[PDB]
């Protein structure tokens, strides 16, 4: 399979302006009739090249003439000798029931639904399946009325009828031209929650959430979140919904999270269905963010779309930024920022050091479904947030306004967005653009000097990005480097130079530069890279007491968290080295005292406290190291938890009890208390066994909501408490019928520290709630094992690698997109020791030799083995 390259982009030889689709729907055999109005832009001798995958072509007509001048080739229908303007008619057949890959038109339980992004429409009919071809769609759906009483596509209903033999039909029209990735069709029998939103200017919008029969009890929060998203986009961005109906359909079988199809979003049910006994606080907040995300795409993605798939971050980075801002404005901004930082440093940094490393605007792609990445999404959003930091809110919004004014109704590029920001604000972003074309994480090194004679403080800041496997050449970036300087009482020292204020966002644009500050009356403690102002590794030689000082005094909640992370990082590293030498955990008394102070500080927001008291994950720990020892990291994490549980026992219990709440509410103050209480519970679980067992068992049994029940269950598993097996069985007996709820349980099994975890996981492949046919189940059992239990995955006998090989051998054929997500832990082999590396390479070579290796896997495997 051949790579495609960004620099090869060329405007299409033909456009399609309007397409009329008819589907004669049936799960075994669906007949598609597609009538397109086309226009030639290129040379008169250029053929029309249509994409198509696994279609059975029935006929081809041009202006109602059966056509002879065409050929099928691999992935294509090539049509020659055309007029300049014509009507193309294609008839073809497809088979939804055979579609295990869940790309194109497929079955989800008894429903039929589509997934077209990135290149799935070509699995439905022969088309210009490229996002710079925007057309007006009309869609007629004909189906069995009993089996498919709801027939939905984008837009509004324009026609409806009933036929003989139990069939009926509905035709839809969407007035906005769209690329075909935004096409959707759904057919099935649903319960429908109906509501309304009235936009600021008075447009009335019918809101319709479609869920499987019997799930209406789990729909209101998603509907509430949709209305919250619509109000927020109006208040913050000045954007209103542009159509008359907003449909969301929740489907159980879905490879990703959710999809912004215009007026007809299709969601993984995981990001729709919640009630207090089935869903945790984190599930509620994920629903809210994903509902918001897809909604936000209506402007950033749909009204302005992507010229080509290399521009994916134009919509994904921007829309992630918007979802984060939405979450942050409605909820705790500090907690949102902390968690987005944890993702960046712990999961995205690892990708940017991997064989799959790419810039946020990639240059080369084999399979575009492989580039729906942490880099494109999360690092993309950090790049947008850097623009926001450089411009300020008002200028950023002027940029958004200029972007839409220029590009509304068109497919645009990352560069067009940057230019809009630059033009609206008059901030020069020429150098800044390199963030789009350069991969890897910059390392920023800071040294300081305080001169008491002149009362000047000097920061010497250097940057470099290490070469990555994709790019041998790197240059300095325009790094917005936010600082704050604290005096000995914890007060901010005004930044100034030569008698004028200096902006606290430093423009670090060179390999090395110095910044000098005047009137610095006390040696400062710096807060550096404030609110993670650029997506960089910071190297500054902090003393422990500078960090604990920041934990007590820093003005932004984020900086207090971050200082705690820097303090812990030193001792994590220490103790991994010690583990390798067979020595037990060592931690200074003063480090423990810093965490005790957080627990007893009444002035700290409990949301902030909870996050300081949540240890970095094993993924975040791994990025502290050049070579990862995943067993040492897992055992050090557990030992640190046990040490703090012992040293802080009485305080932990006291805070645990003080944050008890009898009423459950999905409200941010309540969520914050509960997060703190359950952070305390995690340590208490790892304390003296009898007390731990009683506390955990009681919380599980008395919980009035899934957040509390799961936090108890998860603690019983992590600490291997006596009550564990009984609680796990109780959960299974109560919830086995509910796949979303069982996913939590599969995660706990897959991430268990028990010595026989792999044997248990393999056994769970036959569990009543597990199926290889369902991406959520795969993720929750297999994916959690490979990706979230790196200790067991990287077991020295190589058993974790062999297990993943077997699963991937199945999934390569069944569902290559899911396969490719699951292979990611194996392609990190160069971060591990020689003996692991050998075993991981042997596993990759086995997969490389699969019959019918998917392009999705081929791309990753060949990068990994290079
Ligand atoms: C591949 C698609 C399901 C991704 C979707 N456009 C998103 O917003 O994440
Ligand atoms: Na198939
Ligand atoms: Na067009
Ligand atoms: Na009707
Ligand atoms: Na298109
Ligand atoms: Na907020
Ligand atoms: Na492809
Ligand atoms: Na410029
Ligand atoms: Na110094
Ligand atoms: Na220093
Ligand atoms: Na350091
Ligand atoms: Na099963
Ligand atoms: Zn998106």
Major sheet size, sense and barrel closure? 8 strands, mixed
CATH superfamily of the largest domain: Peptidase M1, alanyl aminopeptidase, C-terminal domain
Bound molecules: leucine, sodium ion, zinc ion
Beta percentage is 15-25%
Domain unit count: 5
CATH third-level topology of the largest domain: Zincin-like fold
Strand order of the largest sheet: 6-5-9-3-2-12-15-14
Q: What value does the Rg take, in angstroms?
A: 28 Å
Shape: globular
Structure description:
The protein has 866 residues and is α+β, with helices and mostly antiparallel strands. It folds into five domains: 11-190, Immunoglobulin-like, CATH 2.60.40; 191-275, Zincin-like (2-Layer Sandwich), CATH 3.30.2010; 276-439, Neutral Protease Domain 2 (Neutral Protease, domain 2), CATH 1.10.390.10; 440-541, Immunoglobulin-like (Sandwich), CATH 2.60.40.1840; 542-866, Zincin-like fold. The protein is 41% helix and 22% strand. It has 27 helices and 33 strands. It has an eight-stranded mixed β-sheet, with no helix packed on it. β5 (56-62) and β6 (65-66) form a beta hairpin. α4 crosses α5 (374-391), α6 (393-407) packs across α7 (414-425) and α24 packs antiparallel against α25. The longest helix has 24 residues, at 557-580. The protein is globular, with a radius of gyration of 28 Å. The two termini are 17 Å apart. It binds leucine (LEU), sodium ion (NA) (11 copies) and zinc ion. Residues 98-100 line the site of one sodium ion. One sodium ion binds at residues 328-329, 331-333. InterPro entries: Aminopeptidase_N-like_N, Aminopeptidase_N-like_N_sf, PepN_Ig-like_sf, Peptidase_M1, Peptidase_M1_dom, Peptidase_M1_pepN, Peptidase_M1_pepN_C, Peptidase_M1_pepN_C_sf. Belongs to the peptidase M1 family.
